Amino acid sequence: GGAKRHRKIL
Amino acid sequence: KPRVLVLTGAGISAESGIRTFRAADGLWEEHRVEDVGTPEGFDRDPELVQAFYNARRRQLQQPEIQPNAAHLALAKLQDALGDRFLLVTQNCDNLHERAGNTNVIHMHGELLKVRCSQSGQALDWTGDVTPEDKCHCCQFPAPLRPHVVWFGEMPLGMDEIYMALSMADIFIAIGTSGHVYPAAGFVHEAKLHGAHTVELNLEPSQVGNEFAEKYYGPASQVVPEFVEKLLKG
Ligand SMILES: [Zn+2]
Numbered sequence: 001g002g003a004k005r006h007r008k009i010l
Numbered sequence: 011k012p013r014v015l016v017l018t019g020a021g022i023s024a025e026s027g028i029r030t031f032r033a034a035d036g037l038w039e040e041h042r043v044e045d046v047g048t049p050e051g052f053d054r055d056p057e058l059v060q061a062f063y064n065a066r067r068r069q070l071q072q073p074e075i076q077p078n079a080a081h082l083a084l085a086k087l088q089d090a091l092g093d094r095f096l097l098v099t100q101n102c103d104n105l106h107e108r109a110g111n112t113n114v115i116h117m118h119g120e121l122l123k124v125r126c127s128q129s130g131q132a133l134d135w136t137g138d139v140t141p142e143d144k145c146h147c148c149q150f151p152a153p154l155r156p157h158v159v160w161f162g163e164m165p166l167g168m169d170e171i172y173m174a175l176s177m178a179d180i181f182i183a184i185g186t187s188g189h190v191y192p193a194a195g196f197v198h199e200a201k202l203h204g205a206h207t208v209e210l211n212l213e214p215s216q217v218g219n220e221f222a223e224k225y226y227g228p229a230s231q232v233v234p235e236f237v238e239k240l241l242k243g
Contacts, residue, residue: 006161
């Protein structure tokens with residue numbers, strides 16, 4: 001799943 | 011009875027008066043996320059970061075902060091399904107617990123816990139964290155940090171979460187924004203392993219054909235109505 005991370009677009 | 015996996019995000023605690031991540035002005039309580047929600051932010055300005063989570067920890071335990079109808083509905087759902095139910099939350103608040111849910115997986119940790127910066131062991135903690143506050147696990151007491159998962163860090167309980175995602179007959183996402191991964195990807199995993207997918211939210215968390223069933227509106231309205239519909243169904 002990988003690290004907690006933010007996506008900005010959509 | 012169906013296996014039901016519920017994922018909750020910030021939206022469900024919004025009506026309870028808890029505020030977080032608006033991916034609009036990019037602000038958390040008028041803080042840039044880089045500054046209060048990353049390992050680098052903590053490294054740069056630990057006193058600021060400790061102050062921020064001190065504030066959040068205090069605000070969480072104020073009388074005006076209460077579980078809302080949505081939280082209660084999820085507690086009733088667990089009551090009805092027993093071991094066929096799992097609740098995974100992105101939230102660091104304890105509102106699910108106060109509502110009556112048990113065995114809640116906090117994939118981003120808990121505001122009412124701190125962690126030893128050396129051993130990584132967690133500790134129950136309801137008050138402020140000061141520099142004078144050190145761990146309980148080491149002979150030489152180590153600094154404490156919030157037991158909250160920051161952007162850039164690995165979420166908690168992921169093995170158990172992905173197992174449940176495979177097993178779920180029904181997957182429900184509640185109050186999630188769709189900007190935060192890997193949680194925002196859970197719906198894909200659920201649908202791949204054959205689950206019926208449901209979104210209960212204010213705004214769409216994802217674009218396209220993933221949620222097979224969707225209802226939008228305030229969590230305190232949409233969640234109890236779906237749970238009721240599910241329970242009588
Ligand atoms: Zn320690």
